[PDB]
Write a protein that binds this ligand. Structure first.
Ligand code: O69
Ligand code: O69
Lengths: 298, 297
């Protein structure tokens, strides 16, 4: 068991560099459109109360320098969609994969291709936190890097990176430019809400531990769904819904362990800790593997 | 984060190789496909295989190689060590700049896990001091490769051959030399006792201070010999002078001397973490090299 990302090649051939004035960041080149954060047009002095419509009307196509590897792309038009800028270019990307845009829910996971100056540096896995932030690894220059899944040769783009908050977590938009969570591309006092643990993912990971041969944390108890939730919330765990229970069904069938019986085991693990032991290499309960991820990998 | 190299340059080299009823993955570079030589073996062959004799009984047509939906005609075969080299009639147009390198225990690399010639996922792994890797691999993953990248050049370092009883994984370099005292034969084999990669734990503590985790720093310093005494005691690898120099940059970037950090690790080893965490971990992480920290940070 490992945090497995998707193979990044299909996304690597879409990464470009976008420069506007003194600002350079990453863009996503699909067909004849380059997508990037609309704050590329801002000078940081603009960031307290930016009027993006007023800022954008003053720009010409040639104010945007887009470079794909060694070749310059010619911008022939531009438009704003929510908080994403769409730069129409003269050339369509011949490496455009089969793709779609998907807005994900808190708890969903995806791979991130971290990029600087249009060139990929690394790939890793992470999750939409319940507070709509992601715990990424991003440095100055990484704005415009994207997150994606690739189930069955279709790239589903779900995240574009915009900002790092004071607590060091990361926020961005879907590829239609709508922010995840209550955040805005503006220098305001916005702070992440208190984060909670993604309960349905912890349960999926415990099922993965059972598949790989550990049973030490099981017990003879069960629980009602409401009693579990009353307990779980006292540990800042997210409520478990009947939807989550249904989604865990396949893992329950494979292991012979009823979902509410695994909930009874999680209750005891939160009460007892791990007693010097580890589960799948970890001394903490892991919440960034979804039920789908466990089935994919195991 | 545990960060892998972008895998695009390698994805274009993965193919499917079938021999008899056995299917696994191959690496297609120019006009040669590389794969584990045990592809030629049946279950009964593995009890005592004579690979030279088993290979002389195969012909080119016994090897079915498929690059996606396109069949590649094998025109020759040979063994190097434990790697089979299938010469094919078409050079891979997607061959990257590459080298075959052999890595040392403690070094890390990315694994592109592959089934039926099709890349499934990518993750970061380290070569343990006992020469195993703690990967995740299912039936069909043999022939998946490990690699590093430096400025356009892919350094291939690992090809997957086997899984041991404890669930860890063993393989060869791309010249077919096994990592560790392992053989591609059906016989009793087991992972040896493993140790913690000290220089990597120190690199990860430096990454922690770069990210604002400082609670484990203290006023104390130590010497190489004092520290290696406690390292021995806790099943850590000895720290050498080369390790201290390899941590040189991080020591300046952070302005914290290596022997100053060692005094922190000493205290973490002796008294534990006291309910606290470092970079989101309740354990001391040893699968990040000093280079890995520099590259990511
Ligand atoms: C408070 N900023 C933010 O967290 C945003 C802006 C930061 N950044 C990053 C970046 C992306 N990941 C993590 C980072 C960590 C440290 C420093 C920078 C980053 N890579 C960048 C590449 C180009 C430009 C910027 C940048 O700095 N742009 C300027 C005009 C700016 C200033 C204030 C902003 C406030 C709110 C929203 C957008 C704002 C934008 C970039 C991210
Ligand atoms: C002692 N096996 C091993 O650790 C590996 C060899 C196995 N495997 C894998 C594979 C690779 N990762 C993890 C696995 C976990 C469970 C099952 C299979 C795997 N994917 C395979 C794809 C094709 C063939 C085999 C296979 O099984 N081949 C047969 C001829 C075989 C039999 C005995 C062997 C003994 C020693 C070495 C190689 C041996 C090889 C494959 C198991």
């Amino acid at each position: 068991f490992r945090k497995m990302a998707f193979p990044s090649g299909k996304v690597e051939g879409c990464m470009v560099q976008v420069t506007c004035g003194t600002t350079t960041l990453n863009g996503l080149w699909l067909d004849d459109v380059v997508y990037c954060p609309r704050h590329v047009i801002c000078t940081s002095e603009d960031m307290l109360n930016p009027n993006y419509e007023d800022l954008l009307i003053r720009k010409s196509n040639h104010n945007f320098l887009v470079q794909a590897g060694n070749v310059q792309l010619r911008v022939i038009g531009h438009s704003m969609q929510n908080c994403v800028l769409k730069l129409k270019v003269d050339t369509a990307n011949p490496k455009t994969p089969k793709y779609k845009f998907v807005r994900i829910q808190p708890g969903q996971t995806f791979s991130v291709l971290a990029c600087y100056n249009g060139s990929p540096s690394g790939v890793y896995q992470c999750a939409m936190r319940p507070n709509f932030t992601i715990k990424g690894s991003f440095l100055n220059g990484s704005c415009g890097s994207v997150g994606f899944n690739i189930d069955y040769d279709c790239v589903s783009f779900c995240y574009m990176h915009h900002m790092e908050l004071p607590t060091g977590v990361h926020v961005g938009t879907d590829l239609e430019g709508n922010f995840y969570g209550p955040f805005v591309d503006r220098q305001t006092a916005q702070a992440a809400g208190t984060d909670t643990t993604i309960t349905v993912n912890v349960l999926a990971w415990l099922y993965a531990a059972v598949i790989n041969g550990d049973r030490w944390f099981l017990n003879r108890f069960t629980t009602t769904l409401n009693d579990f939730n009353l307990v779980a919330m006292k540990y800042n765990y997210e409520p478990l819904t009947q939807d989550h229970v249904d989604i865990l069904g396949p893992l329950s069938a494979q292991t012979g362990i009823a979902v509410l019986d695994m909930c009874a085991s999680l209750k005891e693990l939160l009460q007892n800790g791990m007693n010097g032991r580890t589960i799948l290499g970890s001394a903490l309960l892991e919440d960034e593997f979804t039920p789908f991820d466990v089935v994919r990998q195991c």
